[PDB]
Amino acid sequence: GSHMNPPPPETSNPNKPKRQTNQLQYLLRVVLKTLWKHQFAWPFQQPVDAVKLNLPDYYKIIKTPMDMGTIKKRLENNYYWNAQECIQDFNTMFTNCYIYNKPGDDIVLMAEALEKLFLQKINELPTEE
């Protein structure tokens, strides 16, 4: 895409050690699946195109971009070693939304709804087996 957007986060790297754990399986089959199909998922399903949105300061402010499309691909590609790396990606995504936007903005209300659902799902994350 545009040279004015940054390259998206890595989803593949043969040098990075990888594992499938029951927790990671849960994060794909339950957590991502639940959030991905939510009414409010669409702003989070791909990286922010700051050019298309006319937000030239977006990647001045957000230095750690993350989106659910990247998380989906990481999970599908078995990119992670553990669940905490994936949880951290979700946390980063929500925090970037809250940093860039204002309390009560539509996208923040959407993020808050998804984050509540995320927290409920993580409360049920199984012990690593």
Ligand SMILES: CC(=O)NCC(=O)NCC#CBr
């Ligand atoms: C995904 C994310 O961080 N959201 C940012 C975003 O698109 N804001 C639009 C405006 C205004 Br105040």
